[PDB]
């Protein structure tokens, strides 16, 4: 009687695939099915970007065809949808936050195109980042063998539950040296499900600026922790400000979970959708501050200026324009009142909508800068 | 080097 | 109290050996490892590329004892050889296992001698099954394992957690020549078969079925309205062959072999090319929707590239009632083309040698003469023709 | 509820650290890893070669707590350093394990800071035991592991499944600067024995057996009719030696150490090359196949970077009764060539201080004035040498 | 390519 | 010392 | 680019 | 090549 | 060569 992974893999290999993409290059890679009925496969953006055609090949041989659904080069998750899908198998999600260093992991992919290959390992570490400076990364690190083409693959725990998506490895020679990274499930869950509802990743930000907290700062500012998130300035009029986070604060926990580094938290919340609420654990003057927040963005308006009605049927008013915006480049200034556009007397923003919804190549606005009568031109 | 978040 | 592989490796490791081999051509020394199949006889299986072109072969057991051992057989079309020991005394044999039970998920423990360090053990799992195509010519049904394997591991054992031999490791995939999580092993059931042919015959009785085919992709099953996506599409059914005798249809797809599914053609092609000329096996089919399983037998297949020895250009056989060798071959631009061997011309032979058959030629060619000059005659014209 | 290393790694991982040294030869800085041996003292063990040329050494804890550390010593002959944490508070020390209980096939977990990433964990198995012969100078008795180990895993921990230290990770065999599945680590008992001397003395007391010898291969075993194919062969025994007293003659084959089988001479060398002077030990040996046992202890061995902490060119020999800082070895082109003095003769008179013993140097050698003035008596004459 | 069996 | 996959 | 060893 | 690390 | 323990 010998233990084996073949019972767990028998149920899980159907949910991983191989993907092929096609001056013009032809790409290898791996993806994983999220929704059997609709045929959603997730993978890394760096295999399915610049894709003329997307050809998915399941575990059994069946090639299919897929189209793009969303993309997110900042975290490197991209979603495709299989066309005309029949008899698909969806992998079961796992909650990454239950991962611990020392756990066992299985990496399924399509390395070097050879075919669906399985490789075992353990959780080398968690919360790794700093390899791509301008990138959201909260990587799971595994010593499970992973090579070219295994990207967008599956990292599942011993129960076949998806804990993460294999992404990048550190390897000077171009072959795995025992250091393989993966994006956690919980981030993939947040990024994929956003691409289905909205098509893109809408990831507004709360308004903290700041930098990593090093053990040297612990001494200088009487801070009990050596790893966290230090708040330089809070943006004004942002959620971070409204919630009462101040300069000189230290962030220690996200939703009760501790933080590894500012670069990780910067990624965990970079994948959360707009308006998500959360609770941070702060540290001001060595005392625990718990906050509650809500993310914020980065008709009844226009590209650069804000238009509201005024009076009965008289016309819409530009109430403020920010300098440098497109609507300030076209010349609209504070106080202008639009009575007609393209020989069409306008009242409300609704008669202006249908006129604007014609999407004409030119806009002649019969505004009233002060007491005078002028025309303004846009597009 | 300070990064917004 | 811990888990460990030590109890299994404690009893299996004496059955894995190191191999140091010396060739004479250019002369070289090469490193490797082997597996003791038979204790008394001393049959030690190894890789063919490990042991070819070798004047002196010495085997070093797991103990530290150095032996001598000459060849018993070889087969470079599937990369398996066999050797046997000088004075085999108190050896230990490995236990074979059925490679046809392995699944993608089982744990594997590799053994061998990388970089001549000695007997090193590695742990891993069966990464995938039925791997072929990395070298298109030879028979490949490789077991893929992430167990670490490097230079000199070849001929080493790959054994499951009981220590039963499930494979002989033969290749890796390494862009820098260092293991990066891909090992390739030939299954023990292909190995047991060729170790079984090299004992009784001394060579391999190249079996022949009588079909042709090509790998069934997912495209063919769409239009051919075939249910399965991976199989073997029997394009050509050769006539008067033992294959055709079973009623093998044109346009079928073989999907079963001993009730065991089939990964790929080049795997099924490989799975069959490792068998004796008089074996009997079953094949599951799929003609129009009926899975008709048919028994079968293989029938025979005398190569002449072994008479060339570097000047191979074309195919020469035997004519009539040994009137002479044969030149049906018509090749241009080959190593046997600048020397003007055209069609329809064999004679007696070279250096005053009566050559009327392929064997009579081989009697005296292999006396290694400095220069050899044929006597071939085209039409009525008796000519000569010189080599070396 | 699946098997996992995480519950064991919860407690042991704090005992693993990362070290970051700066120094001179220049300018350079490099990184390694370390293992907390004594919690209350601040005793970190590491690899000597990550510690060479060290001005300032800053450990970093697993939780991000930074510290400072001064050396307690070094051992360039076994590549084991040891260091002392400055102002250590609330540390955790890792438990040891008996390397004499390790068998090939047991499970291992490698901990370090590879590539400056952080505390990275890898798992593997004991690939083999007692690998050595990578550099003749050093006493090595390494453990081979397939656990991934890379640059910065230096002086890391390698542990069994109960979190008990078995090895200090030292070197990898990898042609292309990246782990290919071979890792080497100094066993625990060796690290335990060496560190133990490094606490009391800040140096290692080298005690010798007084025997010469060489590796016994199976071809010499044919020569002497000895039934052992590996072992330790005895060339000659020195007079007035602990071994010569015991009854060791030329022509004996050492087969065991304290009852434990012997893997090689290189291991026998490295194993007792570390034990402190006067350590009792039993040896099993083979004289004409009559398997004779004997016991003995070690005696003293008899016949710069120990003090300089930066330049290992010269070699401070024994002080002497009146003399001091005698030296018996130096290489041409060393940092002991810019200085002016040579191996052939040396004493002391530093900075107009009547000084003779190596300890009396450092009470001014640590004072670090702007300018140093040696005063050896090269030959029969008096001279001086200046510095800084 | 063409395949023989 | 910078790579991606 | 497959190496055999 | 052997690598010390 | 020849080494001395």
Numbering used by the authors:
A (entry chain F): 11 to 32, 82 to 357, 368 to 448
B (entry chain P), E (entry chain O), I (entry chain R): 471 to 475
C (entry chain D): 11 to 35, 82 to 357, 362 to 448
D (entry chain E): 11 to 35, 82 to 359, 364 to 448
F (entry chain L), G (entry chain J), H (entry chain K): 460 to 464
Provide the publication's sentences verbatim.
Interestingly, activation was observed with TMB_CYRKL and TMB_CKYRKL, but not with TMB_CRKL or TMB_CKL. The concentration-dependent activation and inhibition suggest that the tripodal compounds also bind to the active site of DegP. Aside from the allosteric activation, we also analyzed the effects of the two compounds on assembly of cages and cooperative binding of a substrate, and found that both TMB_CYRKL and TMB_CYYKI assemble DegP cages, but that they differently affect the binding of model substrates. Overall DegP structures were almost identical to that of the dodecameric DegP with an active conformation (rmsd 0.697 Å and 0.986 Å, respectively, for 2309 Cα atoms in six DegP subunits). Additional electron density maps were found at positions where two degrons of 18–58 are present in the dodecamer model. Taken together, the crystal structures suggest that the tripodal compounds mainly bind to the substrate-binding sites of DegP.
First, DegP is an allosteric protease, whose activity is carefully regulated, and a hyperactive DegP variant kills bacteria. Second, because DegP is an inherently promiscuous protease that degrades misfolded proteins, over-activated DegP may destroy various proteins that mediate essential processes in the bacterial envelope, such as cell wall maintenance, membrane construction, or cell division. Previous report showed that substrate binding accompanies several allosteric behaviors of DegP: proteolytic activation, assembly of cage-like proteolytic chamber and positively cooperative binding of a substrate. DegP mainly degrades misfolded proteins, but its over-activation by the tripodal compounds triggers excessive degradation of newly synthesized proteins and leads to bacterial death.
